[PDB]
Write a protein that binds this ligand. Structure first.
Ligand code: SF4
Ligand code: F3S
Ligand SMILES: [Mg+2]
Ligand SMILES: [S]
Ligand SMILES: [S]
Lengths: 262, 537
């Protein structure tokens, strides 16, 4: 009766699962007892080994179908052998399961675009989900950030459960959460426009809260809703005095570095 | 302790309710585990990715080693760069960093006990058989936070609706379903722990919120630089008050819910005081004093090494004695000290017993050691620490156990609770000290350049044990960067002498009641709180 959700982990740091656990609209206990049926999640599930594999297959060959949330990139180097689960490569597992889903959501910058392991020199030839499974007709919705705001992850899911309209931008992201730049939303934008910049972290300008562009802020190139919705209902990097490092942007590891310069 | 007469292999892959991807293979004889292999099955290669980059960016990359132990790697990288620069770190940066780290401990350990470990001891379906009035009285007898019969009845009813639905979700195929002789608790105790599991799902949100007050967000904080911290708002009374209010609430949950449930569970599983022991321990200490960032012995608790369980003979910690073996790991070459580390992959095949893991095997002066809360609390004990020695003495008294019970899966699990408790109480003092220091001291950061040539190492004793980051800088860029991470130590493979790592060794002697449902393997592996994103990076 409750809609089936399968959550997969590939090459990831589990940051996205932790973000999910910070959900407050609604809380995670409400989500998995009432709103969905979370039928596979390696971080919290009871079963292990063969019992876990059986739970996963039951879910995937289930009656009502299932929605797949996938965290992490796929390592494709060395015949996909840099990443295994239960004696199967990660490539092989997602190739099998992702086409069976009524829908796929890529959560975190890694599943969306490759992420940290794809950064130069990409030792494992890691690929985001849509790159990797294009050829299979897989077309996931991208919910990036490192990690994403739980409000964006759960929000995307909930809108899908409601048969709602989910407009995407040019790199697959819900415009309802990623349709504006961080900078447009930023409370220090007045300082930017007024040319008021902190020249260093130990300076009066930084102390009075001036713009962080000169110490690297990538807010103007980065699409996310952080200054508007906040993290943990209470803060975001620039408000904590540190520049945005552009973590919801494709290839930010290589394109936004060095982080403390513009 | 129940046990079958099974002779043969057992493989657990995926080993769930951990971070990351772990395969465990064991050999069993007469229902007793005789041999074990720890197999980390994902590699990412963050050390290689770091080469050539700006040392100031390292902390942002390494923080993505792991998001369970979020912040820890940012802290260790910043500490690493700051050792290399070797210029004074503002006292308030130390204070704020220590406070954020203490909050991380409170969050991480709380979630580990309830949401990763408890299902190894708690039979959720048995909770449905409970007398809600009896469960309330059990709950009320172990904590000053009180509950009513009606609240526990309400929990059972919601649970009943869930289970009756047939969609068991994360409890699907749980080892306790249909009954398991390895599960010992009564239904009222099961319902008490199950109710708290659910409460703790919401509570952890508020605990984590605490790190966002100064640290911007959770997960992955964003307030540190080499030279201090960036959060001028942390100097304001409004942010300090908010942080304090959340800390107090977090502390109450730990003291009133987690710690008594941990004691309740331990009281049913005293036989596990004789299962999964180890002999040698290594801790790096944590929470430097202002001005003391470069001195490990300035820390609120200090580093140390203990051999053959001789806690009264804690030895000094000498970082130069750290080496990482690869004989049984999927890399080329031989053992190396981390300033000279190398991470060239050398994969054989999944299921190999010669080379069987993406974890290096770190060794201290050639010996295998366990790190983590148990290690750090024993080392503190041997250093006669002001709150940790009496707290340990009091636990053992409560459970009527001998000290020999510390060296086990039960003791490991208890030590995680003790570390949570003493850090939670000490936070009050750090907070007051910080608040008093900023009356006059308004500095939170110094502007320091990266040197052209240098080396540094950053040390932290974090949720799972001794973390260290090792960097050499040349031409102002990252020449070599190596991480040696707590779960690397605990869940590493055999070394160049064939000697197993701590977890592998701890599994020897485990009884197995059902080879098809290895709750005992999970109990011991979960007691080490493994993170494989961490251990392999
Ligand atoms: S702090 Fe960053 S996001 Fe804010 S106004 Fe400046 S450049 Fe833009
Ligand atoms: S670093 Fe990421 S969390 Fe938001 S403020 Fe920048 S997109
Ligand atoms: Mg390493
Ligand atoms: S990326
Ligand atoms: S930690």
């Amino acid at each position: 009766s409750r809609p089936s959700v399968v959550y997969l982990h590939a090459a990831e740091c589990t940051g996205c699962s932790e973000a999910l656990l910070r959900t407050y609209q609604p809380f995670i206990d409400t989500l998995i007892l009432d709103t969905i049926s979370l039928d596979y999640h390696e971080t919290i599930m009871a079963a292990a080994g063969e019992a876990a594999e059986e739970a996963l297959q039951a879910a995937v060959n289930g009656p009502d179908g299932f929605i797949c949330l996938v965290e992490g990139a796929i390592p494709t180097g060395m015949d996909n052998k840099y990443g295994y689960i239960a004696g199967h490569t990660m490539y092989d597992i997602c190739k099998n399961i992702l086409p069976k889903a009524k829908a796929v959501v890529s959560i975190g910058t890694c599943a969306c675009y490759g992420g940290i392991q794809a950064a130069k020199p990409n030792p494992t030839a890691a690929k985001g989900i849509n790159d990797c499974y294009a050829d299979l007709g897989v077309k996931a919705i991208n919910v990036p950030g490192c990690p994403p705001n739980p409000l964006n992850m759960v929000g995307t899911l909930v809108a899908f459960l409601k048969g709602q309209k989910i407009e995407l931008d040019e790199v697959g992201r819900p415009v309802m959460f990623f349709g504006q730049s961080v900078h447009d939303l930023c409370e220090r934008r007045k300082h930017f426009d007024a040319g008021e910049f902190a020249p260093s972290f130990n300076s009066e300008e930084a102390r009075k809260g001036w713009c962080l562009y000169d110490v690297g802020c990538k807010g103007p190139e980065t699409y996310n809703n952080c200054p508007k919705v906040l993290f943990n209902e209470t803060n975001w990097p620039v408000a904590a005095g540190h520049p945005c490092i552009g973590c919801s942007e494709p290839n930010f590891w290589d394109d936004m570095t060095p982080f403390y310069q513009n | 302790t129940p046990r079958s007469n099974y002779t043969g292999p057992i493989v657990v892959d995926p080993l769930t309710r951990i971070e990351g991807h772990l395969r465990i293979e064991v050999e069993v004889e007469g229902g007793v585990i005789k041999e074990a292999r720890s197999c980390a099955t994902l590699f990412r290669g963050i050390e290689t990715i770091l080469k050539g980059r700006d040392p100031r960016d390292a902390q942002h990359f390494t923080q993505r080693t792991c998001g369970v132990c979020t912040y820890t790697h940012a802290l260790a990288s910043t500490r690493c760069l700051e050792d290399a620069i070797n210029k004074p770190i503002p006292a308030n940066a130390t204070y704020i960093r220590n406070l954020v780290l203490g909050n991380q401990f409170m969050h991480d350990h709380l979630v580990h006990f309830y949401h990763l470990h408890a299902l190894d001891f708690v039979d959720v379906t048995s909770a449905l058989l409970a007398d809600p009035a009896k469960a309330a009285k059990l709950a009320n007898s172990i904590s000053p936070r009180k509950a009513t019969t009606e609240e526990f009845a309400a929990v059972q009813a919601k649970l009943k609706t869930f289970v009756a639905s047939g969609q068991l979700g994360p409890f699907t195929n749980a080892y306790f379903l249909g009954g398991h002789e390895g599960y010992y608790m009564d239904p009222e105790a099961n319902l008490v722990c199950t109710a708290h599991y659910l409460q703790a799902l919401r509570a952890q949100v508020e605990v984590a919120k605490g790190m966002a007050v100064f640290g911007a967000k959770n997960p992955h904080t964003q307030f540190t630089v080499a030279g201090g911290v960036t959060c001028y708002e942390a100097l304001t009374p409004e942010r300090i008050k908010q942080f304090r209010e959340l800390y107090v609430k977090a502390r109450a949950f730990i003291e009133e819910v987690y710690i008594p449930d941990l004691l309740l569970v331990a009281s049913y599983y005293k036989d596990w005081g004789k299962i999964g022991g180890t002999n040698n321990f290594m801790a790096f200490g944590e929470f430097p004093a202002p001005g003391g960032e470069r001195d490990l012995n300035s820390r609120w608790y200090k580093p140390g090494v203990i051999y053959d369980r001789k806690v009264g003979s804690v030895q000094p910690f000498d970082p130069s004695k750290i080496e990482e073996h690869v004989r049984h790991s999927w890399y080329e070459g031989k053992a190396r000290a981390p300033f000279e580390g190398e991470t060239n992959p050398h994969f054989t095949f999944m299921g190999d017993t010669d080379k069987y893991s993406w974890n290096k095997a770190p060794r201290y002066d050639g010996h295998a050691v366990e790190t983590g809360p148990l290690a750090q609390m024993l080392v503190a004990y041997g250093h006669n620490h002001k709150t940790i020695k009496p707290t340990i003495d009091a636990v053992l008294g409560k459970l009527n156990l001998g000290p020999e019970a510390l060296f086990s899966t039960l003791g490991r699990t208890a030590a995680r609770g003790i570390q949570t408790l003493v850090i939670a109480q000490q936070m009050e003092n750090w907070l007051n000290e910080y608040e008093n220091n900023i009356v006059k001291d308004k500095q939170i950061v110094e502007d320091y350049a990266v040197p052209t040539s240098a080396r540094g190492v950053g040390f932290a004793d974090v949720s799972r044990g001794g973390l260290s980051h090792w960097m050499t800088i040349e031409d102002g860029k990252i020449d070599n960067f190596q991480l040696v991470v707590p779960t690397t130590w605990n869940l590493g493979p055999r070394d160049d002498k064939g000697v197993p790592s701590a977890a592998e060794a701890a599994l020897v002697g485990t009884p197995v009641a059902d080879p098809k449902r290895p709750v005992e393997i999970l109990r011991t592996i979960h007691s080490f709180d493994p993170c494989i994103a961490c251990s392999t990076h």
